[PDB]
Structures are given as C-alpha cells and as structure tokens.
Amino acid sequence: KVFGRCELAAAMKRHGLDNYRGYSLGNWVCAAKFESNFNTQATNRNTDGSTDYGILQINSRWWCNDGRTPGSRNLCNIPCSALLSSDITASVNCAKKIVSDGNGMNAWVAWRNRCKGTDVQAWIRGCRL
C-alpha cells in the first residue's frame, strides 16, 4: 500500500505513535516519507546482507527474522514479511521498541539526516487528525 501523507498520519495516530517517546506525529511521517516514500512494501538490502522492511525500513540485523541475516537478532519477535502489510500495526509495534532502545529516532539514519531539527509539523499540516 502507498499511503497519502495525512492518511498515514491518521493511521500512525490510530496506533498510538503520535508523541510516542515524545516524538510528534510529523517526525514519524517525515521518517516514513524518506525511509519508504509511504510504501508499505518497500524492501532495501544493506551492504552487510541485512535487509530493511516496510514503511519505517526496520532492519533484519536486530528487529525481525528473514532467515537470511546470519548472526542477527529478532527483537520484535516477528517475521520481517509482517512489516510489509497494508495494516501498519506490526511496523508501529516494532518501531515503538526501536525508539525506546536508547537513541530515540536517531536509529533511523534518514530521520537524523533529513527530518531531525526541521519543521516536521509541515508533514501533518492540513490533516484532519
């Protein structure tokens, strides 16, 4: 599924991400935009052989099981394929564990490089939330 901006903002708020660990909804929408372009089916292989999955590009090195990331963990206790669903519940639940892990949203390098410090409220501007 390819979400629209306000459609995703609404779904993220529906699943309790708005202001989770103090990160406003615009931070989450901006991270999704630059990680996946709002596409739930996005996959991208890393140089080290891990893969990032879904709307928030969650990495198999730590967070989900894809059966092909030797030495990796599965701290969200989910198959990485669950992170590609039209329903974002699994991605949200796992993202809540990642952003609690100690470095907040810096875990998402695209958030650190493209969203952090910016006018992230623009991402929810106009949305009926």
Ligand SMILES: [Cl-]
């Ligand atoms: Cl957009």
Ligand SMILES: [Cl-]
């Ligand atoms: Cl915001």
Ligand SMILES: [Cl-]
């Ligand atoms: Cl594996």
Ligand SMILES: [Cl-]
């Ligand atoms: Cl594990």
Ligand SMILES: [Cl-]
């Ligand atoms: Cl699995």
Ligand SMILES: [Cl-]
């Ligand atoms: Cl959803």
Ligand SMILES: [Cl-]
């Ligand atoms: Cl923080």
Ligand code: NA
């Ligand atoms: Na893994």
